Design an enzyme around this catalytic site. Structure first.
Site, PDB file in Angstrom:
ATOM      1  N   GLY A 157       0.783  -1.222   0.000  1.00  0.00           N
ATOM      2  CA  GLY A 157       0.000   0.000   0.000  1.00  0.00           C
ATOM      3  C   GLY A 157       0.819   1.279   0.000  1.00  0.00           C
ATOM      4  O   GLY A 157       1.883   1.357  -0.614  1.00  0.00           O
ATOM      5  N   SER A 200       5.356  -6.047  -1.299  1.00  0.00           N
ATOM      6  CA  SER A 200       5.707  -4.637  -1.326  1.00  0.00           C
ATOM      7  C   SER A 200       5.943  -4.126   0.099  1.00  0.00           C
ATOM      8  O   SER A 200       6.728  -4.717   0.842  1.00  0.00           O
ATOM      9  CB  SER A 200       4.585  -3.842  -2.010  1.00  0.00           C
ATOM     10  N   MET A 201       5.272  -3.042   0.482  1.00  0.00           N
ATOM     11  CA  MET A 201       5.459  -2.498   1.825  1.00  0.00           C
ATOM     12  C   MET A 201       5.168  -3.521   2.927  1.00  0.00           C
ATOM     13  O   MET A 201       5.632  -3.366   4.055  1.00  0.00           O
ATOM     14  CB  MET A 201       4.587  -1.254   2.029  1.00  0.00           C
ATOM     15  N   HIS A 243       9.480  -5.356  -4.716  1.00  0.00           N
ATOM     16  CA  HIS A 243       9.563  -4.638  -5.981  1.00  0.00           C
ATOM     17  C   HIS A 243       9.787  -3.153  -5.700  1.00  0.00           C
ATOM     18  O   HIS A 243       9.690  -2.707  -4.546  1.00  0.00           O
ATOM     19  CB  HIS A 243       8.275  -4.851  -6.796  1.00  0.00           C
ATOM     20  N   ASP A 261       8.636  -7.298 -10.339  1.00  0.00           N
ATOM     21  CA  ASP A 261       8.057  -8.091  -9.264  1.00  0.00           C
ATOM     22  C   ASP A 261       8.905  -9.338  -8.982  1.00  0.00           C
ATOM     23  O   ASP A 261       9.240 -10.108  -9.891  1.00  0.00           O
ATOM     24  CB  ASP A 261       6.625  -8.483  -9.619  1.00  0.00           C
TER      25      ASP A 261
END
Lengths: 188, 188, 188, 188, 188, 188, 188
Positions: F58, F87-88, F112, F161
């Protein structure tokens, strides 16, 4: 709206005779605020009430509902401009008990003439025009009385959006005092 | 709507025999209003009830539900116009116990003829037309008895939207007194 | 809906064996009414029950669920028309216990034939037509008995929307008495 | 938000005089935060208050309502930037009690000029233009004072979106210290 | 749904081992009906259970989860058709404990073959086709066993929507008795 | 969410110092997580906290608010990856207390480079470009420190990714241990 | 969902170590299911748990969160298929403790290969393809071990939607026993 222990924040403030108006004024808002005013007045008709005002304005009838109530109950209603008191919002600000109409350093007030709409037959449009022009005279007359400004000046100053600083609102007579410290208020 | 410890602001006022009609009148509203009245009449058939009115009106049938309940219960229902009492709202305003109908200095009242619609075959349109005209005449008859005006005057005065000030409403017979002070009421 | 002290205005009335039907009748509404009727019957199968009706009607199957439950339980169900009792609402009104079917001075009752629809293959359209015509006949027979009117009359008087005043409904046999006073009901 | 048996997580923190501002600033957010501030101040005018800030910003009048209330109450309002404090968010962050304006290591701060709009006649667009340009000076003057940067540096630096790391915010005068440990806070 | 003083109207009936199914049948409704059956079973595996049914039916897998649970638990599950019991709803009605399957005088029941869809490649449509044909045959075998009607007859009778009155339902073997009085129920 | 008597399931677990993060990371989620971390740290700054992570990622700033708060408080924060940490989310996972970063057998992690957008004048696009390129570099340095991987490797491995099995996550340095049994956790 | 008394029907069941999964599996569901599992395991790591299943499946990662958590906790988790268990739902059914994976007579199970999407550059389409294919393989390897079928057969049998009856599911090795009575359950 966080809860205090159980009250919602606003309800907790209501307990200390504090009413918060921080939204546009529509039938619901007036309804809620009017009930709150009547409730407090029932609780103690002698104890003063504090109405915080930060709203862009709204329905003229909703505002007059709030207005007539403030004047109708024994409690004196102190008004505090925080953020912006525009249109009917500003009108409610000046509706506060003479001498108890406040605002904060960076508060803003905006007065202007009523806005409306009319659609249909010429006869219907005329009915609407006539009514809105009358409301403007009533509002203007009351505003002149609250501010001490001549009707002719209110009329001229409300032709187009008239934004004022907290100082200007004082100068115009829309408020009595600009609150700075937590003691500048007569409450303490 | 804030709470009151644990109540609801309106439930709080209800406890003091005060009902707040502050929205367009529809089946929902009518059912809540009627229920509150039946409740209060059960609680105490002797004590009177105060119905504050501030709505643009709505359904004729929903309105009459409220109207009939008002006259139905033993308690005398006092009406108070706050903000605006339009269409069925005005009809209801004038329906309060004779002598106990009030409005505040800047309250507004508007009366006008029923609005409706019809679709389908000529036959169906005529059934609908006959119904609305009949309702119109029913309402006019009750409004006349209530205000004291002659039926023919009510008929003509409701042809188009007719906006009245609290004083015009008083002089018309829609209300009995204009409250100005908290003690100007017969209660306090 | 406001709260009573904890409660809901309707929940509060339910305690007094009063059920309020004030909306269109769909499965959801039917399940609610029925569960209310069964619950009250479980409390005291000997105590009477008051069902207020202000509804434009709706689903036929939903209305029959209410209808059958009304007759099914021991408690006698008294119906009171408020505002408007149309289509299935009027059927439910006429369904109340013989001698305890009331309406208020300005109530309205509307009886008409079933409404419906069908789409698809001719065969499918015939299945629906056959059914809606059967429901109408079932409904007409029940209404004729409940009113005392001959089937032929129910059939012709429902061909198109038939609006009736409280007096006409009394005359038609849809209701037993028109109320006006608080202690003129069956409860006093 | 989870509960804390019975509180709301945010409500629980409010108990320890912690107010979390974690969304865009609108009239709702401002009325809630202002109310929380009044409440706390009423609870104990001597104790400090922590305002955690993580928001993209919002209304200028909504922010000033929060701003004025922070300075207005006796208690000192400490500000902690977490995540991002942009637009009015950064303004508010810099509004914390001098010496008590914090930011965590990887926090971000973004300052920029006001945004608005205007439609209508030249006269109306002029009024709107003048207002927004005026609000820009007002805010710039407060930021200049809070930060120690001269007005025209604030003007140029906010022409386009200006993102500053926690080190840069410190250097600029927006914050007094970059926190790292829990007990490293002046509070504990 | 009204409340009963801390219970929901349906929760109150659940206390008396009465479960209401008055909506379309989907995973949600099924999960709730199964949960209630399980709960009632743990409470007292000896006490009977009543399932009032009034629904247009719905998902087959969902309906079967309810079907299998009814059989699985020790309590005998009595079913009562109120209003309409169609599709999977009719199926569940017929799934009640033999001799304890009821319907009220004006209840309606409708049986028909499964509905479904298929999109994509030929292979994909074939897979779906086989599945629904398989489901239909499975359901038909249970209906046959439950009603006592031959399989061929169930197949032919569900080719298109087949509506039946309560009497026709009884004479078909979908129910065992038509309840008229609160005393015709095996309970009392 | 079900209730445990009376907390909600997440509240119950919050009582055992367990925070659940199973959704995309936005300001609202961040604000709730941060408030939970603070609450726990206030309850007992000595005991460890468990943060379960299952999220697609996010807002970078929303994530950093959580990141910083984790380091900020006294309690050590153990992270456990269930389902997916992308991600985060993967970033937060790696931000757990060294040696106390877990993942379940079939857990999945993905890393990523940052995503974003820009619209408007070249000048505005440059400001956005420089900022996302800065954020990427900032995040990349922390990932390198937290995994042990040289910056250059993190840079090349986050170009597109990059999905990793729990075992690959372990070898990369994103986690320390892969849980299987109830005791394999340092808590038990 | 009704209330049991201070309890939500599902909550009431959670008390008896029963978790109901009757919806598609998304992050929300997994989070709630995992939490309930951790809770139950914390309450008493010895008592087994019953996870009923009626779901169409959903997210693979959300599914694996549940999967890993079931295995991970000490309590043996018994699974009961009711209605339909498809996709990750069938996976979870097969994931239950060996010997405690049940299904009801008319329950249905369905297995197929993963579904997904991929948009953008050829390079990104490839990254997405490899992952989807990798996930398919990981999932088929777990299903093979738990069913007894070789990976080769699991893959072939899932190339397209593969619907299985309770009997077929048993023979395939997805479940251990088909429950019929409330006694054929080891718990009872």
């Amino acid at each position: 709206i966080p809860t205090v222990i159980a009250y919602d924040i606003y309800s907790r403030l209501l307990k200390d005779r504090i009413i918060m108006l921080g939204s546009a004024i529509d039938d619901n808002v007036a309804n809620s605020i009017v009930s709150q005013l009547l409730f407090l007045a029932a609780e103690d008709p002698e104890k003063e009430i504090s109405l915080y005002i930060n709203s862009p304005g709204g329905s003229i009838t909703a505002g007059m509902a709030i207005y007539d109530t403030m004047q109708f109950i024994k409690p004196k209603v102190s008004t505090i401009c925080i953020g912006m008191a525009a249109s009917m919002g500003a009108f409610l600000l000046a509706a506060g008990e003479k001498g108890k109409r406040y605002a904060l350093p960076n508060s803003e007030v905006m007065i202007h003439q009523p806005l409306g709409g009319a659609q249909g037959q010429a006869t219907e449009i005329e009915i609407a025009a006539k009514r809105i022009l009358l409301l403007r005279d009533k509002l203007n007359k009351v505003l002149a009385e609250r501010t001490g400004q001549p009707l002719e000046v209110i009329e001229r100053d409300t032709d187009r959006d008239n934004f004022k600083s907290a100082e200007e609102a004082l100068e115009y007579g829309l408020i009595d005092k600009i609150l700075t410290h937590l003691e500048h208020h007569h409450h303490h």
